[PDB]
Amino acid sequence: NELRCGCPDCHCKVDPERVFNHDGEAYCSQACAEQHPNGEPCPAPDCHCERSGKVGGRDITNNQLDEALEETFPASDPISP
Ligand SMILES: [Cd+2]
Ligand SMILES: [Cd+2]
Ligand SMILES: [Cd+2]
Ligand SMILES: [Cd+2]
């Protein structure tokens, strides 16, 4: 039932109670979750992952975001909890 880190170059135990997800993937920490965007390694002192793959400088981190409205506030408001 242990979760596994998405970083192949990383050696960490991902707890099912503290798994950092990214796009549906499991990671040891949010550090690896972003696949080292600033070359920042995971928060493990014995681990040395940062030059994984061909990451040079940064990655293409751009969100398409959500455009399913912004809760339009009209005069007649729906039932509030
Ligand atoms: Cd690591
Ligand atoms: Cd790690
Ligand atoms: Cd990791
Ligand atoms: Cd890593």
User: At CA 61, angle to CA 19 and CA 43, rounded to 5?
Assistant: 40
Closest of 31, 11, 10, 9 to residue 20, by C-alpha: 31
Q: Residue 11 Cα, ligand 2 centroid: separation in angstroms?
A: 5
Distance CA 36, CA 71 (A): 34
Q: Residue 10 Cα, ligand 2 centroid: separation in angstroms?
A: 5
Q: How many C-beta neighbours within 10 Å does residue 31 have? A: 22
DSSP string, 18-41: S-EEETTEEESSHHHHTT-SSSPP
Distance CA 7, CA 53 (A): 10
Q: Residue 8 Cα, ligand 3 centroid: separation in angstroms?
A: 8
Q: Residue 32 Cα, ligand 4 centroid: separation in angstroms?
A: 5
> Which ligand has the minimum distance to the alpha carbon of residue 5?
3
Are 1 and 16 in contact, with CB atoms under 8 Å apart?
A: yes
Distance CA 24, CA 40 (A): 21
Q: Give Cβ neighbours of residue 26 (< 8 Å, ≥ 6 apart).
A: 3, 4, 5, 6, 14, 19, 20
Domain hosting residue 51, numbered range: 1-81
Q: Which long-range contacts (CB under 8 A, 24 or more apart) does 37-46 make?
A: 37/61, 42/5, 42/7, 42/10, 42/12, 44/10, 44/11, 44/12
